[PDB]
């Protein structure tokens, strides 16, 4: 499916804050304040939307909007079909690595092996005596953050859906593995799946079909990467003006983005 939002505004409603947490709110609800205002986007079947912004700009909230956990108080949103969501929090259920990737869905060999390879999990499971039959306890607590995120990503990607929402999978230290995953999974394997990737890496905007930048629940820019360079030259020159920005930590990339957005409103 494709996805369209026309002039969407979404207000803080009671309970939304806890849901964001479970991944003062009552004041935000009493004062009737938007979490997202005048959002517009039009994404074709098979296209990739890259979403970035300052920290706390509404990136996750926009996903919740697509999931229907947040109501569109004004404006129009259209998409059809199953959506698959990979959250910032990487949840792990009791069971093997395989059982986690396949959770609640039926096993298919070609599909599984293909997902496992593209999410770069082979490098991980090969370190284990029982490979992907290795048993994890909930939280998969002795794994690395990147290992948990790749399992969590594989699970969401293995879901058969029309639209994939990937909230910040690529935020950890093993930064070269992340580059392979983005190339192999998001760009190749899912090349023809409609997908939305929340991200603080510039390569992802550069390879994206559409770009949405958020600041203060507002749309700072929407368009192509070419239009971002010409229509937002201050932002672009500053961020493309590092040599290896994407290999900074997620905290640094995010705070640079925040400062640059604060600067050039
Ligand atoms: N744990 C929290 N405590 C207080 N306010 C929160 C919390 N989580 C979310 N919010 C509110 O959520 C609004 C939008 O949050 P959110 O949609 O999670 O933005 P975000 O861009 O995904 N944040 P981040 O992933 O850290 O860069 C913020 O500006 C906050 O007002
Ligand atoms: Mg978020």
Domain with residue 204: its CATH number is: 3.40.50.300
Ligand 1 center from residue 95 Cα (angstroms): 31
Query: What Å resolution does this PDB entry report?
Result: 2.5
- Annotated binding-site residues read 12, 53-60, 88
| Domain enclosing residue 136, as ranges | 1-265
Tell me how many degrees the CA angle 79-80-86 measures, rounded to the nearest 5: 80
The residues, any chain, with a CB within 8 Å of residue 54's CB and separated by 6 or more, are 214, 215, 216, 254, 257, 258, 261, 262
The residues, any chain, with a CB within 8 Å of residue 2's CB and separated by 6 or more, are 42, 43, 44, 45, 47, 78, 79, 194
**Number of folded domains that form the chain:** 1
Instruction: Locate the ligand 1 atom nearest the alpha carbon of residue 64 and give its number.
Output: 17
Strand arrangement of the beta sheet that strand 48-53 belongs to: 74-78, 3-11, 34-43, 218-223, 210-215, 48-53, 194-198, 163-167, 83-86
The residues, any chain, with a CB within 8 Å of residue 161's CB and separated by 6 or more, are 81, 82, 83, 84, 193
Distance CA 250, CA 247 (A): 8
Residues in the chain after which the chain is broken, C→N over 2.5 Å:
23
Rg (CA), the chain: 18
DSSP run (H or E) holding 16: helix 16-22
What does residue 140 show for φ and ψ, rounded to 5 degrees? 40, 55
> Within 13 Å of residue 45, how many CA atoms lie on the same side as its CB?
5
DSSP state, residue 139: G
DSSP state, residue 45: T
Choose which residue among 19, 34, 55, 56 to substitute to test ligand 1 binding: the one with the highest number of ligand atoms within 8 A of its C-beta.
Answer: 56
Distance CA 13, CA 233 (A): 36
17 neighbors 84 (Cβ within 8 angstroms): no
Instruction: Locate the ligand 1 atom nearest the alpha carbon of residue 57 and give its number.
Output: 21
SS3 content of the chain, % helix, strand, coil (to 5): 40, 25, 35
Q: How many other C-beta atoms are found inside a 10 Å radius of the C-beta of residue 142?
A: 8
What does residue 123 show for φ and ψ, rounded to 5 degrees? -55, -30
Distance CA 143, CA 148 (A): 6
Choose which residue among 10, 20, 217, 252 to substitute to test ligand 1 binding: the one with the highest number of ligand atoms within 8 A of its C-beta.
Answer: 20
* Ligand 1: residue whose CA is nearest its atom 3: 21
Sign, CA torsion 125/138/152/219: negative
- Annotated binding-site residues for ATP read 12, 53-60, 88
Ligand closest in space to the Cα of 62 = 1
144 neighbors 78 (Cβ within 8 angstroms): no
DSSP run (H or E) holding 204: helix 202-206
User: Under DSSP, is residue 4 helix (H, G, I), strand (E, B) or coil?
Assistant: strand
Closest CA to 62 of 195, 217, 225: 217
The pocket around ligand 1, CB under 6 angstroms, is made up of 20-21, 35, 53, 55-61
Q: Method of determination?
A: X-ray
Closest CA to 3 of 53, 54, 39: 39
64 neighbors 16 (Cβ within 8 angstroms): yes
Distance CA 77, CA 65 (A): 9
Tell me how many degrees the CA angle 256-156-215 measures, rounded to the nearest 5: 25
């Amino acid at each position: 499916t494709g996805i369209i939002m026309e002039n969407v505004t979404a207000f803080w409603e009671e309970g939304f804050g806890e849901l964001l947490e479970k991944v003062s709110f009552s004041h935000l609800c009493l004062v009737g304040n938007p979490v997202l205002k005048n959002i517009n986007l039009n994404i074709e079947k098979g296209e990739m939307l890259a979403i970035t912004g300052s920290t706390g700009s509404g990136k996750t909230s926009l996903l919740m909007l697509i999931l229907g956990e947040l109501e569109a108080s004004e404006g129009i949103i259209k998409h059809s079909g199953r959506v698959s969501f990979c959250s910032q929090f990487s949840w792990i259920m009791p069971g093997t690595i395989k059982e986690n990737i396949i959770f609640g869905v039926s096993y298919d060999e070609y599909r599984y092996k293909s997902v496992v390879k593209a999410c770069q999990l082979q490098q991980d499971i090969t370190k284990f005596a029982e490979q992907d039959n290795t048993v994890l306890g909930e939280g998969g607590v002795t794994l690395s953050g990147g290992q948990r995120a790749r399992i969590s990503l594989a699970r969401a990607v293995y879901k058969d859906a029309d639209l994939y929402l990937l909230d910040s999978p690529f935020g950890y230290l093993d930064v070269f593995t992340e580059e392979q995953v983005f190339e192999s999974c998001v760009c190749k394997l899912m090349a023809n799946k409609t997908r939305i990737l929340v991200t603080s890496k510039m390569e992802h905007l550069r390879k994206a079909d559409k770009i949405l930048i958020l600041h203060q629940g507002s749309s700072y820019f929407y368009g192509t990467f070419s239009e971002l360079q010409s229509l937002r030259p201050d932002f672009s020159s500053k961020l493309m003006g590092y040599d290896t920005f994407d290999q900074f930590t997620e905290e640094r990339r995010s705070s640079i983005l925040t400062e640059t957005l604060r600067r050039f409103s």
